[PDB]
Design a protein around this ligand. Structure first.
Ligand SMILES: CC(C)CCC[C@@H](C)[C@H]1CC[C@H]2[C@@H]3CC=C4C[C@@H](OC(=O)CCC(=O)O)CC[C@]4(C)[C@H]3CC[C@]12C
Ligand SMILES: CC(C)CCC[C@@H](C)[C@H]1CC[C@H]2[C@@H]3CC=C4C[C@@H](OC(=O)CCC(=O)O)CC[C@]4(C)[C@H]3CC[C@]12C
Ligand SMILES: Nc1ncnc2c1ncn2[C@@H]1O[C@H](COP(=O)(O)OP(=O)(O)OP(=O)(O)O)[C@@H](O)[C@H]1O
Ligand SMILES: [Mg+2]
Length: 1036
């Protein structure tokens, strides 16, 4: 639902808002950007929608859009135009302006659009361009800079400049600059990814009225304008309708199919034009026109129907630009985690105030010091660390061949519990092998014919020859693999279509009804010289096409004979025919409606084909099943063929049980029923058809959750039915992945949490995830990358918490003794060590093999907080032990407490505290960076390992080498080598203790947590169902 509110302009209110929010504080700006309804209300007054100059859009969220005026006044929301329809006093989308008009109207527009009426609907519809905003760098820098995080960083820069910490202020500025530039690079890269995809700049003829032509730019086209498509072919600038001609288009860019598609001129009728019904007669935007030819007239004519964001390509671009929110929250209780850190910081700030008071510090100094301590806990490198983590994940995927348009989905990749796969072309090979055709003699089958060439000239041979949709493109037949191989098997050659016998008269296709996956069949009307009347041949599902056949034609053993082949893994389609008494002419043949042709058929035979598993499918499915990720086959193919393939690829193990859930439609006077008939060979799977799925959904809502929870093979599913299944699975708190192929899986790929397409270009719009490899091996790759990304994000958050608390503790320890950490020492710690390490941790790749344990979903967990608390206990212990150890030495000299820092540097206390803490930052970085299960070992990250080794060597030189970096850093020289070695020993103790603490926690905390308090249940609805089925299996 949506709602609109109009806000008429007024200067007094605007200036009042400006002065109030500028003089008062930045807090009102913060709450306005958090609650912008108040901001808009205060800025301007509600007004009648007719005069509104600004609107607020809810869907409940509010987006403020200005109302452009040209009078024609409109507005753009998410790239979609809405104009002011004066008569109705409302804003209607321009997508609906001509919605529902007739095909005869398109054929009338055929003549062209007069230039006086062209500019009108250019204004209403706007330019024909899917325009992605290209921005000046200042605009970006403003967009990131106005982040409140960078506002606090600038406040810190000013605060530390006010205290004469120039190097630390420069350090903060440089780190924030790095973060901002990384964000700019990220946004710029995504924007170019979109723009390069939506590029279009070309000149296209327009059939201007009066019989003349004109070369206008592609962006001057408007719906109702007439195109002249080139004969040699070219890209399509906008959605259109063919009014005259024939076109061979490659719609791979829009839908991912590399098989050429034929487009025919639009029929004439008093029915509503549509891009779904007349998809065959309509060209799309961004699809390539391989070749065009005009049946009648000098040139091929098309009439534009949608432009800009109205087009299907525009809709996909809009969905990419403005994606639906990711419901899953990767980091549970993040606000409470940062609050648990902030409470510790606040207790430390109270301690700081108390001690600074106890040392008789001036009040202004006390407040400045407390503000400094508050700024210490906010790390300037956190945004850079997060951005770099995401960038590294994306780069790793890209190197593996996987492209993601929404990088936020990479983390969902590691959340997957269920992956749905389409069978043909995803699990099994694209190519077929015609194993033979089973003919019929009366009402009985005949032995399979391995070579359909040997068939006698008759209805079955001609049905095989000419029941398809193939087009010779560059002297090579192209089209469906099934059609290609089935025609190849007969020996007839292609040349509205005519076929020459192998060596028996040429056969002509009068009319052809294309294959629709909803119908799962196609048909032709065919005549040959010497033919009494045309004949129609229907090819489609053996089950479905047999229903169209006359009962006396279909043999009594039809189902058993079909199962003989499909249960052996073969793809089978039935061929049926019927004589059409119509005169054998193109005009009369085209008169027939599809429904009349499809029914009352006579079965001719079964075409048996052999599609084999990809060799990469069984390993991947066994790997997924090994890690308790559900593999589900969602296919439009036979149930027996699909079940055989599922057993073959390991979706159903040899020792596991499979039950065929069969639902019967509720006949007259009786209710619907379910039959469960097991078939001979977690451990119990269900296999069911599309009709059964629909019956169970409509009539058995109570049993549907169980069918979904233990259903593995979903056969004979229509595309919308695959989408419905994915949505139903997601209703059970499943994170559903979908590995799809073509138009039959686009809805499921959109609905799925992770949708993957296999044989794709470098950058594609088909699905959120696209890959270049043909196999489904990209699925484990995506899951592994998502798990690595979750683990890396958790490790980076842990390191930033640990680094902050460590700096906080050291600065508190130094405040307690009336000194500080020195200026170039802040610069060193924050820039050289910590930023380097934090931006290098996240470059280590995923583990090579998936595992049964999933990454944690909550930052605020007992393991995480126990780890941080014990790590900080050890850090504080080491620092305070070093401090109380330097006091016991004989050469020690207490600092000049009278003058506060930085006046009293160098001193021994600061020297020791800085050395220990500077080692502890590296120690903590190495500790948080873990390997198995979700990541590779630390030492496989050469930049990170080298940074650790180099920084450790530099710090050891600082501690040992006399006079090294002591002037700059303000370090007190310590001659005693025994104390230096004892400091290094304490550092080694800290390292060993940190690593052993992490190992002990990881190994023994989950078990103690389980024993102490077992989980009563799981909120995952599907896990509740899984357990409930465990006590009582549903099918008895
Ligand atoms: C005073 C010195 C010690 C400052 C230390 C800071 C560096 C460790 C940081 C600052 C920003 C970091 C850079 C942030 C951005 C990235 C991008 C990253 O590559 C990608 O993310 C995508 C690559 C592609 O598109 O193919 C390579 C590392 C790099 C340059 C990082 C390398 C390490 C850098 C230079
Ligand atoms: C007083 C002096 C002697 C001490 C100062 C030492 C630092 C300036 C050195 C020590 C380790 C060095 C870092 C060691 C490793 C790297 C990784 C390098 O980035 C990459 O290699 C990414 C390559 C890719 O991913 O393609 C950027 C430089 C950097 C941060 C170096 C920057 C300078 C550092 C921080
Ligand atoms: N060119 C064609 N002519 C006639 N019938 C066809 C043709 N192509 C497919 N069929 C039949 O229609 C059905 C549709 O299955 P199809 O594979 O197109 O659906 P799908 O959902 O894409 O399946 P998958 O997920 O396995 O790709 C098949 O069972 C097949 O028997
Ligand atoms: Mg398919």
């Amino acid at each position: 639902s949506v709602r609109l509110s109009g806000y008429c302009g007024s200067p007094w209110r605007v200036i009042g808002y400006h002065v109030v929010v500028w003089m008062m504080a930045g807090i009102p700006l913060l709450l306005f950007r958090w609650k912008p309804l108040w901001g808009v209300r205060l800025r301007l007054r509600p007004c009648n929608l007719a005069h509104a100059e600004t609107l607020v859009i809810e869907i409940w969220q509010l987006f403020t859009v200005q109302v452009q005026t040209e009078v024609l006044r409109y507005y753009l929301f998410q790239g979609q135009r809405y104009i002011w329809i004066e008569t109705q006093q409302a804003f209607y989308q321009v997508s609906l302006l001509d919605h529902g008009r007739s095909c005869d109207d398109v054929h009338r527009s055929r003549h062209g659009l007069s230039l006086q009426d062209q500019m009108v609907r250019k204004a209403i519809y706007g330019p024909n361009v899917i325009s992605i905003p290209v921005k000046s760098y200042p605009q970006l820098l403003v967009d990131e800079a106005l982040n409140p995080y960078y506002g606090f960083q600038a406040f810190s820069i000013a605060l530390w400049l006010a205290d004469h910490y120039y190097w630390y202020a420069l350090c903060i500025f440089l780190i924030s600059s790095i973060s901002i530039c990384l964000s700019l690079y990220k946004t710029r890269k995504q924007s170019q990814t979109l723009r390069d995809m939506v590029k279009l700049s070309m000149r296209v003829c327009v059939c201007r009225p009066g019989g003349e032509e004109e070369w206008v730019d592609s962006s001057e086209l408007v719906p109702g304008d007439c195109l002249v498509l080139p004969q040699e072919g070219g890209l399509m600038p906008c959605d259109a309708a063919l009014v005259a001609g024939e076109c061979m288009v490659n719609e791979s860019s829009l839908t991912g199919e590399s098989i050429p598609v034929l487009k025919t001129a639009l029929p004439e009728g008093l029915g509503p034009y549509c891009a779904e019904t007349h998809r065959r007669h309509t060209l799309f935007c961004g699809t390539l026109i391989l070749q065009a030819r005009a049946y009648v007239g000098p040139h091929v004519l098309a009439v534009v129907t949608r432009t800009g964001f109205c087009t299907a390509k525009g809709g996909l671009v809009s969905s990419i630009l403005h994606p639906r929110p990711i419901n899953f929250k990767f980091y549970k209780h993040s606000m409470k985690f940062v609050a648990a850190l902030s409470v510790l910081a606040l207790l430390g700030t109270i301690y700081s105030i108390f001690i600074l008071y106890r040392n008789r510090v001036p009040l202004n100094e006390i407040v400045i010091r407390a503000l400094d301590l508050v700024t210490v806990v906010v790390p300037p490198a956190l945004p850079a660390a997060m951005t770099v983590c995401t960038l590294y994940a994306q780069s790793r995927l890209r190197r593996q061949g996987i492209f993601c348009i929404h990088p936020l989905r990479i983390n969902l990749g590691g959340k997957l519990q269920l992956v749905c796969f389409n069978k043909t072309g995803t699990l099994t090979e694209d190519g077929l092998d015609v194993m033979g055709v089973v003919p019929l003699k009366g009402q009985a089958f005949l032995p399979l014919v391995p070579e359909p060439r040997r068939l006698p000239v008759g209805p079955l041979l001609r049905a095989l020859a000419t029941c398809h949709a193939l087009s010779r493109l560059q002297d090579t037949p192209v089209g469906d693999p099934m059609d290609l191989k089935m025609v190849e098997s007969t020996g007839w050659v292609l040349e509205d279509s005519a076929f020459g016998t192998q060596v028996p008269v040429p056969v002509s296709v009068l009319h052809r009804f294309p294959f629709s996956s909803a119908l799962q069949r196609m048909s032709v009307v065919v005549a040959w010289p010497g033919a009494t009347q045309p004949e129609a041949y229907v090819k489609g599902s053996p089950e479905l096409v047999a229903g169209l056949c006359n009962p006396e034609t279909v043999p009594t053993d039809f189902a058993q004979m079909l199962q003989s082949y499909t249960a052996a893994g073969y793809r089978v389609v039935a061929l049926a025919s019927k004589p059409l008494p119509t005169v054998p002419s193109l005009e009369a043949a085209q008169q027939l409606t599809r429904d009349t042709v499809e029914g009352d058929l006579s079965l001719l035979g079964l075409l048996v084909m052999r599609n084999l598993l990809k060799p990469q499918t069984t390993p991947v499915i066994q790997a997924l099943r090994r890690t308790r990720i559900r593999a589900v086959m969602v296919t439009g193919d036979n149930l027996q063929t699909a079940v055989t393939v599922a057993r073959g690829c390991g979706m159903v193990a040899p020792q596991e049980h499979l039950i065929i859930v069969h639902a019967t439609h509720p006949e007259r006077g009786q209710p619907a029923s379910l039959e469960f008939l097991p078939m001979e060979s977690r451990s119990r799977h269900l296999a069911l058809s599309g009709p059964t799925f629909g019956i169970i959904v409509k009539h058995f809502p109570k049993l549907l959750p169980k069918v979904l929870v233990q259903g593995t093979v979903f056969a004979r599913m229509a595309p919308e039915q695959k989408t419905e299944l994915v949505c139903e699975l997601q209703k059970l708190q499943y994170c559903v992945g979908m590995c799809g192929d073509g138009a039959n899986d686009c809805g499921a790929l959109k609905a799925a949490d992770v949708g993957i397409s296999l044989s794709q270009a470098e950058a594609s719009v088909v699905s959120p995830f696209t890959s270049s490899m043909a196999s489904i091996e990209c699925v484990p790759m995506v899951i592994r990358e998502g798990r690595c990304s979750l683990d890396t994000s958790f490790s980076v958050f842990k390191y930033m918490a640990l680094y902050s608390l460590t700096q906080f503790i050291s600065v508190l320890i130094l405040y307690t003794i009336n000194t500080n950490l020195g200026d170039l020492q802040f610069l060193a710690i924050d820039l050289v060590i910590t930023t380097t390490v934090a931006v290098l941790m996240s470059r280590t790749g995923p583990a090579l093999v998936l595992g049964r344990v999933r990454p944690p979903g909550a930052l605020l967990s007992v393991p995480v907080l126990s780890s941080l608390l014990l790590q900080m206990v050890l850090v504080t212990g080491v620092q305070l032990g070093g401090y109380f150890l330097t006091l016991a030495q004989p050469w020690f000299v207490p600092l000049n407490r009278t003058v506060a820092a930085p006046d009293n540097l160098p001193n021994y206390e600061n020297t020791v505290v800085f050395s220990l803490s500077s080692f502890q930052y590296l120690i903590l970085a190495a500790a948080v960076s873990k390997g198995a299960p979700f990541r590779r070992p630390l030492y496989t990250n050469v930049p990170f390992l080298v940074a650790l080794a180099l920084l450790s060597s530099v710090l050891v030189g600082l501690v040992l080498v006399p006079g090294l970096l002591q002037g700059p850093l303000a370090l007190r020289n310590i001659t005693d080598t025994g104390f230096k070695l004892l400091l290094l020993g304490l550092v080694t103790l800290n390292f060993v203790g940190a690593f052993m603490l992490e190992s002990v926690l990881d190994q023994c905390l989950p078990a103690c947590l389980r024993r102490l308090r077992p989980k009563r249940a799981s909120k995952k609805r599907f896990k509740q169902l899984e357990r409930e089925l465990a006590e009582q299996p549903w099918p008895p």
